[PDB]
Amino acid sequence: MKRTWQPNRRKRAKTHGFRARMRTPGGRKVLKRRRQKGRWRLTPAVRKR
Amino acid sequence: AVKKFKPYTPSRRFMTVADFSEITKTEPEKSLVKPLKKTGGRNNQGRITVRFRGGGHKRLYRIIDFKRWDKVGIPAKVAAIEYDPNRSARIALLHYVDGEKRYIIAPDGLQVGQQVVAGPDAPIQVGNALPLRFIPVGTVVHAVELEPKKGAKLARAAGTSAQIQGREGDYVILRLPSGELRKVHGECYATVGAVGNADHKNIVLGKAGRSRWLGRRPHVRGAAMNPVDHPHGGGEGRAPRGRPPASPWGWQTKGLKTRKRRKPSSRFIIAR
RNA sequence: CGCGGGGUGGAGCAGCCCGGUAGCUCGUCGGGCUCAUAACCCGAAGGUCGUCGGUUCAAAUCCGGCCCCCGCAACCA
RNA sequence: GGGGAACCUGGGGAACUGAAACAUCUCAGUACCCAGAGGAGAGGAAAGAGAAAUCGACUCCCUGAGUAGCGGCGAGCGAAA
RNA sequence: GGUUCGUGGAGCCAUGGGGGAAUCUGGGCGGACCACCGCCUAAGGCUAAGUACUCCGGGUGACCGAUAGCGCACCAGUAC
RNA sequence: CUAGCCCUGGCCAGGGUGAAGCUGGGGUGAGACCCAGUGGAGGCCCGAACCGGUGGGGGAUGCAAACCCCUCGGAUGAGC
RNA sequence: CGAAUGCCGGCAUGAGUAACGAUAAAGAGGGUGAGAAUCCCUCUCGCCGUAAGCCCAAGGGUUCCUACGCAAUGGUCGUCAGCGUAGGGUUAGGCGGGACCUAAGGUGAAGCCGAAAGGCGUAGCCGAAGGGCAGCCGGUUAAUAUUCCGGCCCUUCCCGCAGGUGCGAUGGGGGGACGCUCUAGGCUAGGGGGACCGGAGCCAUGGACGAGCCCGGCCAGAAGCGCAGGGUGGGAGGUAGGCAAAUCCGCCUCCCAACAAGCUCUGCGUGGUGGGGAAGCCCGUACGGGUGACAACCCCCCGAAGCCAGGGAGCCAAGAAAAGCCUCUAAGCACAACCUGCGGGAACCCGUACCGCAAACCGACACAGGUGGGCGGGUGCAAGAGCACUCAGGCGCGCGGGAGAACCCUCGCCAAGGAACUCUGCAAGUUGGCCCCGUAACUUCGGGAGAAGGGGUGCUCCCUGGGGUGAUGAGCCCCGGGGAGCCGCAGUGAACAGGCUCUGGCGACUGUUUACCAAAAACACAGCUCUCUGCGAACUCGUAAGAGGAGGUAUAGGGAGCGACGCUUGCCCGGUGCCGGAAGGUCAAGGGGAGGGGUGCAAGCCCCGAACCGAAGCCCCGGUGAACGGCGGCCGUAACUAUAACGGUCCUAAGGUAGCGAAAUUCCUUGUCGGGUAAGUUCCGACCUGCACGAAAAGCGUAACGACCGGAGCGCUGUCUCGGC
RNA sequence: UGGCACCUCGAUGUCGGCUCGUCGCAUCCUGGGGCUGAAGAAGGUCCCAAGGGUUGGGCUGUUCGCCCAUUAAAGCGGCA
Ligand SMILES: [Mg+2]
Ligand SMILES: [Mg+2]
Ligand SMILES: [Mg+2]
Ligand SMILES: [Mg+2]
Ligand SMILES: [Mg+2]
Ligand SMILES: [Mg+2]
Ligand SMILES: [Mg+2]
Ligand SMILES: [Mg+2]
Ligand SMILES: [Mg+2]
Ligand SMILES: [Mg+2]
Ligand SMILES: [Mg+2]
Ligand SMILES: [Mg+2]
Ligand SMILES: [Mg+2]
Ligand SMILES: [Mg+2]
Ligand SMILES: [Mg+2]
Ligand SMILES: [Mg+2]
Ligand SMILES: [Mg+2]
Ligand SMILES: [Mg+2]
Ligand SMILES: [Mg+2]
Ligand SMILES: [Mg+2]
Ligand SMILES: [Mg+2]
Ligand SMILES: [Mg+2]
Ligand SMILES: [Mg+2]
Ligand SMILES: [Mg+2]
Ligand SMILES: [Mg+2]
Ligand SMILES: [Mg+2]
Ligand SMILES: [Mg+2]
Ligand SMILES: [Mg+2]
Ligand SMILES: [Mg+2]
Ligand SMILES: [Mg+2]
Ligand SMILES: [Mg+2]
Ligand SMILES: [Mg+2]
Ligand SMILES: [Mg+2]
Ligand SMILES: [Mg+2]
Ligand SMILES: [Mg+2]
Ligand SMILES: [Mg+2]
Ligand SMILES: [Mg+2]
Ligand SMILES: [Mg+2]
Ligand SMILES: [Mg+2]
Ligand SMILES: [Mg+2]
Ligand SMILES: [Mg+2]
Ligand SMILES: [Mg+2]
Ligand SMILES: [Mg+2]
Ligand SMILES: [Mg+2]
Ligand SMILES: [Mg+2]
Ligand SMILES: [Mg+2]
Ligand SMILES: [Mg+2]
Ligand SMILES: [Mg+2]
Ligand SMILES: [Mg+2]
Ligand SMILES: [Mg+2]
Ligand SMILES: [Mg+2]
Ligand SMILES: [Mg+2]
Ligand SMILES: [Mg+2]
Ligand SMILES: [Mg+2]
Ligand SMILES: [Mg+2]
Ligand SMILES: [Mg+2]
Ligand SMILES: [Mg+2]
Ligand SMILES: [Mg+2]
Ligand SMILES: [Mg+2]
Ligand SMILES: [Mg+2]
Ligand SMILES: [Mg+2]
Ligand SMILES: [Mg+2]
Ligand SMILES: [Mg+2]
Ligand SMILES: [Mg+2]
Ligand SMILES: [Mg+2]
Ligand SMILES: [Mg+2]
Ligand SMILES: [Mg+2]
Ligand SMILES: [Mg+2]
Ligand SMILES: [Mg+2]
Ligand SMILES: [Mg+2]
Ligand SMILES: [Mg+2]
Ligand SMILES: [Mg+2]
Ligand SMILES: [Mg+2]
Ligand SMILES: [Mg+2]
Ligand SMILES: [Mg+2]
Ligand SMILES: [Mg+2]
Ligand SMILES: [Mg+2]
Ligand SMILES: [Mg+2]
Ligand SMILES: [Mg+2]
Ligand SMILES: [Mg+2]
Ligand SMILES: [Mg+2]
Ligand SMILES: [Mg+2]
Ligand SMILES: [Mg+2]
Ligand SMILES: [Mg+2]
Ligand SMILES: [Mg+2]
Ligand SMILES: [Mg+2]
Ligand SMILES: [Mg+2]
Ligand SMILES: [Mg+2]
Ligand SMILES: [Mg+2]
Ligand SMILES: [Mg+2]
Ligand SMILES: [Mg+2]
Ligand SMILES: [Mg+2]
Ligand SMILES: [Mg+2]
Ligand SMILES: [Mg+2]
Ligand SMILES: [Mg+2]
Ligand SMILES: [Mg+2]
Ligand SMILES: [Mg+2]
Ligand SMILES: [Mg+2]
Ligand SMILES: [Mg+2]
Ligand SMILES: [Mg+2]
Ligand SMILES: [Mg+2]
Ligand SMILES: [Mg+2]
Ligand SMILES: [Mg+2]
Ligand SMILES: [Mg+2]
Ligand SMILES: [Mg+2]
Ligand SMILES: [Mg+2]
Ligand SMILES: [Mg+2]
Ligand SMILES: [Mg+2]
Ligand SMILES: [Mg+2]
Ligand SMILES: [Mg+2]
Ligand SMILES: [Mg+2]
Ligand SMILES: [Mg+2]
Ligand SMILES: [Mg+2]
Ligand SMILES: [Mg+2]
Ligand SMILES: [Mg+2]
Ligand SMILES: [Mg+2]
Ligand SMILES: [Mg+2]
Ligand SMILES: [Mg+2]
Ligand SMILES: [Mg+2]
Ligand SMILES: [Mg+2]
Ligand SMILES: [Mg+2]
Ligand SMILES: [Mg+2]
Ligand SMILES: [Mg+2]
Ligand SMILES: [Mg+2]
Ligand SMILES: [Mg+2]
Ligand SMILES: [Mg+2]
Ligand SMILES: [Mg+2]
Ligand SMILES: [Mg+2]
Ligand SMILES: [Mg+2]
Ligand SMILES: [Mg+2]
Ligand SMILES: [Mg+2]
Ligand SMILES: [Mg+2]
Ligand SMILES: [Mg+2]
Ligand SMILES: [Mg+2]
Ligand SMILES: [Mg+2]
Ligand SMILES: [Mg+2]
Ligand SMILES: [Mg+2]
Ligand SMILES: [Mg+2]
Ligand SMILES: [Mg+2]
Ligand SMILES: [Mg+2]
Ligand SMILES: [Mg+2]
Ligand SMILES: [Mg+2]
Ligand SMILES: [Mg+2]
Ligand SMILES: [Mg+2]
Ligand SMILES: [Mg+2]
Ligand SMILES: [Mg+2]
Ligand SMILES: [Mg+2]
Ligand SMILES: [Mg+2]
Ligand SMILES: [Mg+2]
Ligand SMILES: [Mg+2]
Ligand SMILES: [Mg+2]
Ligand SMILES: [Mg+2]
Ligand SMILES: [Mg+2]
Ligand SMILES: [Mg+2]
Ligand SMILES: [Mg+2]
Ligand SMILES: [Mg+2]
Ligand SMILES: [Mg+2]
Ligand SMILES: [Mg+2]
Ligand SMILES: [Mg+2]
Ligand SMILES: [Mg+2]
Ligand SMILES: [Mg+2]
Ligand SMILES: [Mg+2]
Ligand SMILES: [Mg+2]
Ligand SMILES: [Mg+2]
Ligand SMILES: [Mg+2]
Ligand SMILES: [Mg+2]
Ligand SMILES: [Mg+2]
Ligand SMILES: [Mg+2]
Ligand SMILES: [Mg+2]
Ligand SMILES: [Mg+2]
Ligand SMILES: [Mg+2]
Ligand SMILES: [Mg+2]
Ligand SMILES: [Mg+2]
Ligand SMILES: [Mg+2]
Ligand SMILES: [Mg+2]
Ligand SMILES: [Mg+2]
Ligand SMILES: [Mg+2]
Ligand SMILES: [Mg+2]
Ligand SMILES: [Mg+2]
Ligand SMILES: [Mg+2]
Ligand SMILES: [Mg+2]
Ligand SMILES: [Mg+2]
Ligand SMILES: [Mg+2]
Ligand SMILES: [Mg+2]
Ligand SMILES: [Mg+2]
Ligand SMILES: [Mg+2]
Ligand SMILES: [Mg+2]
Ligand SMILES: [Mg+2]
Ligand SMILES: [Mg+2]
Ligand SMILES: [Mg+2]
Ligand SMILES: [Mg+2]
Ligand SMILES: [Mg+2]
Ligand SMILES: [Mg+2]
Ligand SMILES: [Mg+2]
Ligand SMILES: [Mg+2]
Ligand SMILES: [Mg+2]
Ligand SMILES: [Mg+2]
Ligand SMILES: [Mg+2]
Ligand SMILES: [Mg+2]
Ligand SMILES: [Mg+2]
Ligand SMILES: [Mg+2]
Ligand SMILES: [Mg+2]
Ligand SMILES: [Mg+2]
Ligand SMILES: [Mg+2]
Ligand SMILES: [Mg+2]
Ligand SMILES: [Mg+2]
Ligand SMILES: [Mg+2]
Ligand SMILES: [Mg+2]
Ligand SMILES: [Mg+2]
Ligand SMILES: [Mg+2]
Ligand SMILES: [Mg+2]
Ligand SMILES: [Mg+2]
Ligand SMILES: [Mg+2]
Ligand SMILES: [Mg+2]
Ligand SMILES: [Mg+2]
Ligand SMILES: [Mg+2]
Ligand SMILES: [Mg+2]
Ligand SMILES: [Mg+2]
Ligand SMILES: [Mg+2]
Ligand SMILES: [Mg+2]
Ligand SMILES: [Mg+2]
Ligand SMILES: [Mg+2]
Ligand SMILES: [Mg+2]
Ligand SMILES: [Mg+2]
Ligand SMILES: [Mg+2]
Ligand SMILES: [Mg+2]
Ligand SMILES: [Mg+2]
Ligand SMILES: [Mg+2]
Ligand SMILES: [Mg+2]
Ligand SMILES: [Mg+2]
Ligand SMILES: [Mg+2]
Ligand SMILES: [Mg+2]
Ligand SMILES: [Mg+2]
Ligand SMILES: [Mg+2]
Ligand SMILES: [Mg+2]
Ligand SMILES: [Mg+2]
Ligand SMILES: [Mg+2]
Ligand SMILES: [Mg+2]
Ligand SMILES: [Mg+2]
Ligand SMILES: [Mg+2]
Ligand SMILES: [Mg+2]
Ligand SMILES: [Mg+2]
Ligand SMILES: [Mg+2]
Ligand SMILES: [Mg+2]
Ligand SMILES: [Mg+2]
Ligand SMILES: [Mg+2]
Ligand SMILES: [Mg+2]
Ligand SMILES: [Mg+2]
Ligand SMILES: [Mg+2]
Ligand SMILES: [Mg+2]
Ligand SMILES: [Mg+2]
Ligand SMILES: [Mg+2]
Ligand SMILES: [Mg+2]
Ligand SMILES: [Mg+2]
Ligand SMILES: [Mg+2]
Ligand SMILES: [Mg+2]
Ligand SMILES: [Mg+2]
Ligand SMILES: [Mg+2]
Ligand SMILES: [Mg+2]
Ligand SMILES: [Mg+2]
Ligand SMILES: [Mg+2]
Ligand SMILES: [Mg+2]
Ligand SMILES: [Mg+2]
Ligand SMILES: [Mg+2]
Ligand SMILES: [Mg+2]
Ligand SMILES: [Mg+2]
Ligand SMILES: [Mg+2]
Ligand SMILES: [Mg+2]
Ligand SMILES: [Mg+2]
Ligand SMILES: [Mg+2]
Ligand SMILES: [Mg+2]
């Protein structure tokens, strides 16, 4: 029953990435409230090598 | 001609493929004068704009010569005839003395080893390219420029052929494959002859499959969709149009002329 | 049994909406033409305008009931 | 060059609702988007107001006034001296 | 488009398009318009103060008192 | 996730039928054509993986927010 | 505050009830321990084996190993653990990425466009399981190893010495470079054998010390050699092309060479040399360690879908780029510089534990689901990755114990009958592999065909014909034919393996579909017609720029409808649509001002406003039906009745032709006749008063296909009589 | 078959079949019995009386119904 969540590092760092948010003017605003709100994680955690 | 197949399978009972007799000796293309990575993909930046396009065999573009006036005088021996998968018509690979090789959308009657050339000088004969106005009024030609030095454009679709009717001051009258009569500038080069493989029009795809090979995706009829999707759709149990036949977008499809009126192009044309 | 149209000499239609007279084609009847019939020519006759009541000075024609004929409707159940 | 809770100017700019239906009208130049400004910003020394031959840059508060007016003259909106 | 002004007798201040002056006996305004009579000088620019806000610091409360009070008095914008 | 398309890779046991072409023979003025043999075609056939999901039964606070079992469809293609 | 299926919290009821997550299965003796069916050990037993076993990628992130433990988590127990605490553990120039390349796509100097945010976009840059690039076999740890160590073998950089040479670019050229299907010639992994070689041992219960039983008979390896095969003509003249230049490529001409030889480059053997190396027996918690050995390490046969590989043949749908790498010359420099030897140095960053078809990934769970790549042994069954059993290896699924009721599930069998069951033979049966007979209508000649329906199939001895490896013989494998004979109820002896005919409707056909109630007669489809489009095409996305169309150009693009194929596709443009009409009527801003008005003492300043000139559209004239659409009513007549070819009359734009027809269309209607059945509202054939068929929303047919829907029959059956065990 | 709409629209699942029945009598059969246009045998009709029986098939989703073959008979109706 193949589900909705199929993990993929690149796909995730490239989609909701920090540099991604910066690229777009809407991305910026996200962070902006994420900061204002006082979140410990602005972007999702996902690493590599 | 065209080969037919014994019906040892349905979808074969009617299939026919163009024979490749004059396909000279080839198969592989000249890797200099072409090919070029051909950017395949059925739409513009983003959305799709030409429905039912997609998939279907890989393809390498053949950068063919469309302005022979480049090398006036310099002649060429017709090296061979190749299959180009980007155009109904066949093509000719020629060797100029100059040492430069080019491909020329090949005309009917064209023979390997035979010779040809371009320029005012040139003799009126299959393959030679001349400024329209230096052509014998009434001699059919193919590959024709529209406005001088702006490349070839009319007639280049297999069996296609334009014909001189007469000339006026600068222009010469031409009857394009559309029966339409038009005037073109004398300076526009045209290469005498008449394209070839005039049979293409007689191939029978045979099976839904082959239409995908070419790269043509299944085409949904309007009367199948739903109102939201198309002007022809709903109530079902089949149904007549119920309004003048329309396009997905709304314009009448049978009749309604679309050539814009106030065009500059007119004043140079006289009916289709 | 809802809604709409209609029923005029032997046949098929018009007249009615804007009430006072009922017209047309065919057929029917007499005369002619032809050896004779048909065709054709001349002339003629022929109708409670479904039916019962009502409106008016007067009704096919305007109003109402009854009857018959045709068209559409009879759905969510 | 980017940031800053609100406040500020400008460039854009809705709809639900109200009208006991809805279409002009209202909700509103409101929400939200964008750019810029700074501890403020805006405005500011008259081609002004208005009837007094009068006042005298701008800004902000109270009155004037829910007046004058505006308005499917409906719902409602609403100054300045 | 703005003004109370939704074409209305619609002026005034802005303009997108078109036409297109003048230099002070020149030129705008006083709610169509004209004549009187007044008012003011447009098409460059700057300017404190009084005003608004409160992330931050402090003071008070006929304010709350751990289901209340900020979502968090507790390592919460966390765990999840 | 799901739909489509673009770039680059991968996958499809084993069987079966046997097209065109060739070669020889036959035939004819020359042919078409007729035989064998070779040959290997095809949204061709039987059938695993693989992709499906036809009928029936179970499951129905499940093993499971779509599953299990038997049984079927396609399987070099508009294939996965 | 009692109520808002109110909000938060707590605790009840059902209930000691249903459950405890695949019916692959367990049993005993020792151990340990406060306490064990549940943990360690050993012996039996069962299950997986194209796996339920190995290796890799993603994802997960310490779950790896070890020492202590058991409150909680493990659907029971727990002395165990993937759980708690603590400590170890993941070692490279050559493996994978980065210091190399380019794909789609991103981004993007120029430059374009946008009210702002921002949208495009040339070169370049980023971008990979694609390209390019230097390593194998062993030993070692509790836990890492193509990294540590051993043996053998390579790769670039910098410097140095010796020797060649016009050396040299981000530029020119070559190459890299490429499809699908079918294939050859050799090899290899891998496997089967052996009368031969090496081995601890065993003769058990009647028999055998036998060319017996049983275990094992290899792996890596530079140079040079061989044995396969891939690559590539050498010269000389010219030269106007490869956007500078070339001695290079590309062209012409002439010499030699020519299904080769030569030079090259792989693979495969062999190779100096190095390493491994059962069974069984002995210790032994664990699960390793000796011994076997100075182990032997040889011969045949089968053999890849893997290698040689850019090999070959055939076909059309005609099959990436860039760098490395060669070569050619530019500025330069020619004491440089490259090229070749040989020495000596230099050689970074990140990953490397462990699970990995799963109790460690995606499914809230130790969830009977889902997850890409490679290896995946042996025997048999015609083949195979199938089926049955079994190696290596790994498991008995984290609740058990007894009983032996109903009832449910899954399964087996059955008297006689056989579909009488039922909406329907739904379900279940029947049939099923292979070899050989033998097969009808109809047909688009292919098909229908595995049509149907038959027989054979085991084992023993004899005779004999062909293949491949040796060599033309031996053995070893692989294809046959004939002749006798044995035994069972039965010989594809178990497991995998069509039930079959006849005749209708729909769709031609293989395909698609409502992920999670519909797979269909619906969609698609080749094909046919219509209509737009002459190229800065038409159409589509976009405010624009730009882009798709297309690096296409009417044998092509877009839009629509029908929908293989055959035979056909009637009549009507009155209304609507679309096409054509340089005339008319109407027609808005605008032009034009007849003439009127408000003001001033006036010059003037301001307003109106009729002619008449003024588009497209509309009206008006024509066309057009595989454009939207439409395609009559009433009376009357013939040698008996009946009907009605014929007629009369209204009405129209015209008044349904062919062909079909109680139909996927028929209301009345189980229409009326025939056919099938003992009996037939359905079914097949007819007839036509077609409520309300009918010609590309096609008409009527049609071979072949349909997990489509309907009606017969044969076979066989627990579907049923009617249940039973 | 309807009319009314009274409880139920925070839900009272509708035809038919199968299974399991049970009740009524306005008795289909078998028991009594009066009449009779009752010789007999058969019937007709009406009165008592359900105690117990009340078949199997073909066509239809059918209930009903039409048939085939029998029978002592092949009852009708209530129980959402
Ligand atoms: Mg989820
Ligand atoms: Mg992805
Ligand atoms: Mg090629
Ligand atoms: Mg290239
Ligand atoms: Mg984009
Ligand atoms: Mg493909
Ligand atoms: Mg098409
Ligand atoms: Mg279609
Ligand atoms: Mg539809
Ligand atoms: Mg849409
Ligand atoms: Mg629409
Ligand atoms: Mg429609
Ligand atoms: Mg319909
Ligand atoms: Mg024409
Ligand atoms: Mg009524
Ligand atoms: Mg009458
Ligand atoms: Mg007479
Ligand atoms: Mg007469
Ligand atoms: Mg009268
Ligand atoms: Mg009267
Ligand atoms: Mg309705
Ligand atoms: Mg209904
Ligand atoms: Mg800022
Ligand atoms: Mg604003
Ligand atoms: Mg609204
Ligand atoms: Mg309202
Ligand atoms: Mg409303
Ligand atoms: Mg307002
Ligand atoms: Mg200020
Ligand atoms: Mg002031
Ligand atoms: Mg208010
Ligand atoms: Mg108004
Ligand atoms: Mg306004
Ligand atoms: Mg004024
Ligand atoms: Mg202006
Ligand atoms: Mg003045
Ligand atoms: Mg002004
Ligand atoms: Mg003014
Ligand atoms: Mg005034
Ligand atoms: Mg003033
Ligand atoms: Mg100034
Ligand atoms: Mg200031
Ligand atoms: Mg404070
Ligand atoms: Mg304090
Ligand atoms: Mg208190
Ligand atoms: Mg709180
Ligand atoms: Mg706080
Ligand atoms: Mg605190
Ligand atoms: Mg998927
Ligand atoms: Mg799809
Ligand atoms: Mg792919
Ligand atoms: Mg064959
Ligand atoms: Mg010959
Ligand atoms: Mg043959
Ligand atoms: Mg042949
Ligand atoms: Mg062969
Ligand atoms: Mg197939
Ligand atoms: Mg098939
Ligand atoms: Mg299958
Ligand atoms: Mg595989
Ligand atoms: Mg299923
Ligand atoms: Mg079920
Ligand atoms: Mg159930
Ligand atoms: Mg099948
Ligand atoms: Mg198959
Ligand atoms: Mg209360
Ligand atoms: Mg209970
Ligand atoms: Mg119980
Ligand atoms: Mg459960
Ligand atoms: Mg229980
Ligand atoms: Mg369990
Ligand atoms: Mg035990
Ligand atoms: Mg024990
Ligand atoms: Mg156990
Ligand atoms: Mg054990
Ligand atoms: Mg032992
Ligand atoms: Mg096996
Ligand atoms: Mg597999
Ligand atoms: Mg398991
Ligand atoms: Mg990982
Ligand atoms: Mg996890
Ligand atoms: Mg941990
Ligand atoms: Mg240990
Ligand atoms: Mg322990
Ligand atoms: Mg515990
Ligand atoms: Mg547990
Ligand atoms: Mg559990
Ligand atoms: Mg426990
Ligand atoms: Mg475990
Ligand atoms: Mg632990
Ligand atoms: Mg090393
Ligand atoms: Mg690795
Ligand atoms: Mg470096
Ligand atoms: Mg570095
Ligand atoms: Mg580079
Ligand atoms: Mg890089
Ligand atoms: Mg690119
Ligand atoms: Mg930029
Ligand atoms: Mg961009
Ligand atoms: Mg790059
Ligand atoms: Mg490659
Ligand atoms: Mg690579
Ligand atoms: Mg490389
Ligand atoms: Mg490497
Ligand atoms: Mg080697
Ligand atoms: Mg390990
Ligand atoms: Mg190792
Ligand atoms: Mg080493
Ligand atoms: Mg080397
Ligand atoms: Mg030197
Ligand atoms: Mg030298
Ligand atoms: Mg050189
Ligand atoms: Mg030089
Ligand atoms: Mg260079
Ligand atoms: Mg170089
Ligand atoms: Mg190059
Ligand atoms: Mg090729
Ligand atoms: Mg081979
Ligand atoms: Mg070997
Ligand atoms: Mg071997
Ligand atoms: Mg073998
Ligand atoms: Mg063996
Ligand atoms: Mg052996
Ligand atoms: Mg061996
Ligand atoms: Mg032996
Ligand atoms: Mg031997
Ligand atoms: Mg021995
Ligand atoms: Mg020995
Ligand atoms: Mg021995
Ligand atoms: Mg010994
Ligand atoms: Mg011994
Ligand atoms: Mg011995
Ligand atoms: Mg013995
Ligand atoms: Mg042995
Ligand atoms: Mg042996
Ligand atoms: Mg080996
Ligand atoms: Mg070796
Ligand atoms: Mg040469
Ligand atoms: Mg030369
Ligand atoms: Mg040159
Ligand atoms: Mg040059
Ligand atoms: Mg060679
Ligand atoms: Mg070699
Ligand atoms: Mg080697
Ligand atoms: Mg060697
Ligand atoms: Mg050794
Ligand atoms: Mg050993
Ligand atoms: Mg050893
Ligand atoms: Mg011990
Ligand atoms: Mg032991
Ligand atoms: Mg030893
Ligand atoms: Mg020893
Ligand atoms: Mg071989
Ligand atoms: Mg292979
Ligand atoms: Mg091969
Ligand atoms: Mg290869
Ligand atoms: Mg090849
Ligand atoms: Mg070769
Ligand atoms: Mg120089
Ligand atoms: Mg040097
Ligand atoms: Mg060197
Ligand atoms: Mg060295
Ligand atoms: Mg090193
Ligand atoms: Mg490791
Ligand atoms: Mg590892
Ligand atoms: Mg595990
Ligand atoms: Mg593993
Ligand atoms: Mg799996
Ligand atoms: Mg796997
Ligand atoms: Mg595993
Ligand atoms: Mg476990
Ligand atoms: Mg977990
Ligand atoms: Mg478990
Ligand atoms: Mg699982
Ligand atoms: Mg899990
Ligand atoms: Mg899948
Ligand atoms: Mg899978
Ligand atoms: Mg194998
Ligand atoms: Mg064996
Ligand atoms: Mg096997
Ligand atoms: Mg056997
Ligand atoms: Mg087999
Ligand atoms: Mg298996
Ligand atoms: Mg098995
Ligand atoms: Mg064995
Ligand atoms: Mg084992
Ligand atoms: Mg495992
Ligand atoms: Mg065990
Ligand atoms: Mg269990
Ligand atoms: Mg386990
Ligand atoms: Mg038995
Ligand atoms: Mg049996
Ligand atoms: Mg029986
Ligand atoms: Mg029997
Ligand atoms: Mg039977
Ligand atoms: Mg029978
Ligand atoms: Mg039956
Ligand atoms: Mg029956
Ligand atoms: Mg029955
Ligand atoms: Mg049936
Ligand atoms: Mg069945
Ligand atoms: Mg059988
Ligand atoms: Mg059988
Ligand atoms: Mg035949
Ligand atoms: Mg048979
Ligand atoms: Mg048989
Ligand atoms: Mg035997
Ligand atoms: Mg003999
Ligand atoms: Mg023999
Ligand atoms: Mg032999
Ligand atoms: Mg061999
Ligand atoms: Mg034999
Ligand atoms: Mg005997
Ligand atoms: Mg026998
Ligand atoms: Mg026998
Ligand atoms: Mg068998
Ligand atoms: Mg058999
Ligand atoms: Mg069997
Ligand atoms: Mg079987
Ligand atoms: Mg079968
Ligand atoms: Mg059929
Ligand atoms: Mg039918
Ligand atoms: Mg179909
Ligand atoms: Mg058809
Ligand atoms: Mg569909
Ligand atoms: Mg599907
Ligand atoms: Mg569905
Ligand atoms: Mg389904
Ligand atoms: Mg299907
Ligand atoms: Mg057609
Ligand atoms: Mg547009
Ligand atoms: Mg088209
Ligand atoms: Mg077209
Ligand atoms: Mg259709
Ligand atoms: Mg059709
Ligand atoms: Mg018409
Ligand atoms: Mg018309
Ligand atoms: Mg007309
Ligand atoms: Mg027109
Ligand atoms: Mg005017
Ligand atoms: Mg005017
Ligand atoms: Mg005046
Ligand atoms: Mg006056
Ligand atoms: Mg004035
Ligand atoms: Mg006009
Ligand atoms: Mg009009
Ligand atoms: Mg009709
Ligand atoms: Mg009929
Ligand atoms: Mg019938
Ligand atoms: Mg019929
Ligand atoms: Mg029918
Ligand atoms: Mg009958
Ligand atoms: Mg029957
Ligand atoms: Mg009948
Ligand atoms: Mg029809
Ligand atoms: Mg019709
Ligand atoms: Mg027609
Ligand atoms: Mg039609
Ligand atoms: Mg038909
Ligand atoms: Mg048919
Ligand atoms: Mg199909
Ligand atoms: Mg009632
Ligand atoms: Mg209700
Ligand atoms: Mg309730
Ligand atoms: Mg309820
Ligand atoms: Mg029922
Ligand atoms: Mg009684
Ligand atoms: Mg009696
Ligand atoms: Mg009966
Ligand atoms: Mg039936
Ligand atoms: Mg009853």
Swiss-Prot record, chain A:
UniProt xrefs under PROSITE patterns: RIBOSOMAL_L34
This protein's record includes keyword Membrane: no
Cellular-component GO terms for this entry: ribonucleoprotein complex; ribosome
The UniProt record lists the keyword Ribosomal protein: yes
Key words of the record: Ribonucleoprotein, Ribosomal protein
Coiled-coil spans in chain: none
Xref: InterPro entries: Ribosomal_bL34, Ribosomal_bL34_CS
Segments for region (Disordered): 26-49
Compositional bias per record (Basic residues), positions renumbered to this chain: 29-49
GO molecular function term, any single one: structural constituent of ribosome
GO terms classed as biological process: translation
Other facts: The open reading frame (ORF) for this protein is entirely within the ORF for the RNase P protein (RnaP). The two start codons are separated by four nucleotides.
Complex and partners: Part of the 50S ribosomal subunit.
HAMAP family, alphabetized: Ribosomal_bL34 (MF_00391)
Family per similarity comment: Belongs to the bacterial ribosomal protein bL34 family.
Function noted in UniProt: Found on the solvent side of the large subunit.
Protein name, per record: Large ribosomal subunit protein bL34
Organism of provenance: Thermus thermophilus (strain ATCC 27634 / DSM 579 / HB8)
Curated annotation (Swiss-Prot), chain B:
Keywords: Ribonucleoprotein, Ribosomal protein, RNA-binding, rRNA-binding
Span list, region Disordered: 222-272
Keyword Ribosomal protein: yes
GO molecular function: rRNA binding; structural constituent of ribosome; transferase activity
Keyword rRNA-binding found: yes
Signal peptide annotation: none
Biased composition (Basic residues): 256-272
Gene Ontology biological process terms from the UniProt entry: cytoplasmic translation
GO annotation, cellular component aspect: large ribosomal subunit
NCBIfam families documented for this protein: rplB_bact
Protein name: Large ribosomal subunit protein uL2
Organism: Thermus thermophilus (strain ATCC 27634 / DSM 579 / HB8)
